[PDB]
Write a protein that binds this ligand. Structure first.
Ligand code: SF4
Lengths: 42, 156, 114, 110, 98, 82
């Protein structure tokens, strides 16, 4: 029974699975001396 | 009068307190850093002077620029100096941080670390000997010893 | 006179790569301004980008402009990540530099430099 | 009230120490720091193992609080029921630890 | 009864009126749940300690532990939202209406 | 993006949002190269303003020839449904 308020309610997906809609990057300072660009996953 | 004598006594008290616990920030750039580490050896033993070894740059009182300060490192050194709390002192190791030394005419070497930060004590050498830097540290302690902060504050 | 090309076979491909590099730089300029808490506006930075792009515009060799495209892409990639400081970005704006004399009279007054 | 007197004295001494460390050096006229970390602009990653070990700590501490009253309970008349209950509770702790071992809990943060 | 009893009732009603009309994410709801936890714990402990019911000292501690585990469950639920939408806001919980 | 009049109206609106263009000399069939007297990079940022306000990827092999607003609206209209 569609009205104005509920006119935008799409039908649900048939499998009832929502679509799913990275990794850390570190910039170690030079504070020998080395500047490391570090990529981490935890 | 009473006031000048009292502020003189307080000035030498806080002056002894500041000069007896100089915590450094060592910049491990080049040869002169290895000479600093050999000044940290048990023979010379900075730690008996109230000078700790390898303190964090957020609590250090003095900074010793040991090595060549190139163009790629000067903003980092200026950032470190700006982060370090007041009062802050700078001691220059070697000819590299004095005036460039060997690499004075190189294209990517800052001709002296005085162009980036104010420098108090210049220690000459390539590398200066460990006892030479110890004498420079004692000279910095004597420079602190004759500071007149409270007398100038009361006179102003 | 026959040479080995680098990436572009003719002038048109080099022009297309110039266009793509300028598009990427124009995309990046607001993000670069915001990231380094810069003192300039967005339009001032885009004006600087245009001024470099038109300063380096009097060369017609495809290999030369191809090398310049590659160097500009390295500059763009270095500004993509946080690899430069505020100093390296601000170096393009010669602000602390005193303005040199340009006309003949002031150049005659200041010294012997032509 | 003596305990609260000690607590108030200790808290006020801590307040005095932080007041000395926060407002006493403000007399000096050193400088103003304009000051224009590896974290450039990315969001903080949600390392799930830390949350998992935190709630594991929570569950273990809860049933440690369950396990607590044995020194007071040791004077009870029915010692056999106490012994069975305590052994079975520590066995439950061992079983929960074994399950947390088996289902990939103690991996990548061992 | 005693005035502290009525103060605990007023505290529980404060936690109730804070738990229902929220505007923030689920952490505020769980904090008000812990307010209900604390109010019920203090009220039960005061009742048991005032009437000298010795055995029902089993009531307060247990009244925590069980729901405490339940509270832990709620934390995991928030992590699920933090693994799906980035933020645990309640305004993102409008997918089941249609 | 419903009717051709509205999309060309918003194209004109974002076109005179550009400040180096002259609205007095601006017409509906003018040329970005000769009639408007604009540099190629100015046409590039006009294309990118279309890209930003509309929201898709305008490629590089077909933006070379898009020198007039009529061809602008033709190109976005045939690439869309309209
Ligand atoms: S002054 Fe000499 S010893 Fe010291 S860092 Fe420079 S080259 Fe090395």
């Amino acid at each position: 029974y569609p009205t104005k308020e509920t006119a935008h309610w799409k039908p649900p997906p048939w499998n009832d699975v929502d679509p799913p809609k990275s990794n850390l990057t570190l910039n170690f300072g030079p504070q020998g001396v080395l500047r490391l660009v570090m990529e981490l996953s935890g | 009068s009473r006031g000048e004598y009292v502020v003189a006594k307080l000035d030498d008290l806080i002056n002894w307190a500041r000069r007896s616990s100089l915590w450094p920030m060592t910049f491990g750039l080049a040869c002169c850093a290895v000479e600093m580490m050999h000044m940290a050896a048990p023979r010379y033993d900075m730690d008996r002077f109230g000078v700790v070894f390898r303190a964090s740059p957020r609590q250090s009182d003095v900074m010793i620029v040991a090595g060549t300060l190139t163009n790629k490192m000067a903003p980092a050194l200026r950032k470190v100096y700006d982060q370090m709390p007041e009062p802050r002192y700078v001691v220059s190791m070697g000819s590299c941080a004095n005036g460039g030394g060997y690499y004075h005419y190189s294209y990517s070497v800052v001709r002296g670390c005085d162009r980036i930060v104010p420098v108090d004590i210049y220690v000459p050498g390539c590398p200066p000997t460990a006892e030479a830097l110890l004498y420079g540290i004692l000279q910095l302690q004597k420079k602190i010893k004759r500071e007149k902060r409270l007398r100038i504050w009361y006179r102003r | 006179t026959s040479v080995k090309p680098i990436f572009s076979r003719d002038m048109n491909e080099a022009k297309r790569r110039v266009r793509e590099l300028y598009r990427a730089w124009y995309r990046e300029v607001p993000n670069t301004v915001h990231l380094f808490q810069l003192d300039i506006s967005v339009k001032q930075g885009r004006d600087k980008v245009r001024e470099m792009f038109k300063k380096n515009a009097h060369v017609t060799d495809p290999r030369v402009v191809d090398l310049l495209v590659i160097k500009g892409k390295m500059e763009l990639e270095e500004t993509i990540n946080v690899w430069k400081q505020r100093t390296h970005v601000m170096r393009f704006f010669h602000e602390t530099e005193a303005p040199r004399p340009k006309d003949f009279l002031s150049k005659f007054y200041v010294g012997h430099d032509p | 009230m003596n305990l609260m007197i000690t607590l108030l004295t200790n808290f006020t001494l801590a307040t005095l120490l932080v007041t000395i460390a926060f407002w006493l050096p403000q007399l000096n006229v050193y400088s103003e720091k304009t000051s224009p970390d590896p974290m450039g602009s990315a969001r903080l990653p949600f390392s799930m193992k830390f949350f998992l070990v935190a709630i594991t700590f929570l569950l273990f501490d809860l049933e440690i609080a369950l396990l607590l009253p044995l020194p007071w309970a040791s004077q009870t008349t029915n010692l056999n029921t106490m012994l069975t209950m305590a052994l079975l509770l520590i066995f439950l702790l061992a079983v929960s630890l074994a399950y947390e071992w088996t289902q990939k809990g103690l991996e990548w943060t061992e | 009864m005693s005035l502290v009893y009525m103060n605990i009732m007023m505290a529980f009603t404060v936690s109730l009126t804070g738990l229902l009309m929220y505007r923030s994410h689920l952490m505020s709801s769980l904090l008000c749940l812990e307010g209900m936890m604390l109010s019920l714990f203090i009220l039960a402990t005061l009742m048991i300690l005032n009437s000298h019911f010795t055995l029902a000292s089993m009531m307060p501690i247990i009244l925590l532990v069980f729901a405490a585990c339940e509270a832990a469950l709620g934390l995991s639920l928030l992590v699920m939202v933090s693994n799906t939408y980035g933020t645990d806001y309640v305004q993102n919980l409008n997918l089941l209406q249609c | 993006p419903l009717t051709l009049e509205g999309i060309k109206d918003r194209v004109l609106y974002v076109l005179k949002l550009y400040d180096k263009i002259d609205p007095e000399k601006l017409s509906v069939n003018s040329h970005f190269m000769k009639d408007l007297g604009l540099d190629s990079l100015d046409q590039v940022e006009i294309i990118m303003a279309m890209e930003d306000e509309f929201g898709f990827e305008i490629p590089d092999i077909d933006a070379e020839k898009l020198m007039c607003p009529q061809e602008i609206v033709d190109y976005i209209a045939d690439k869309k449904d309209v």
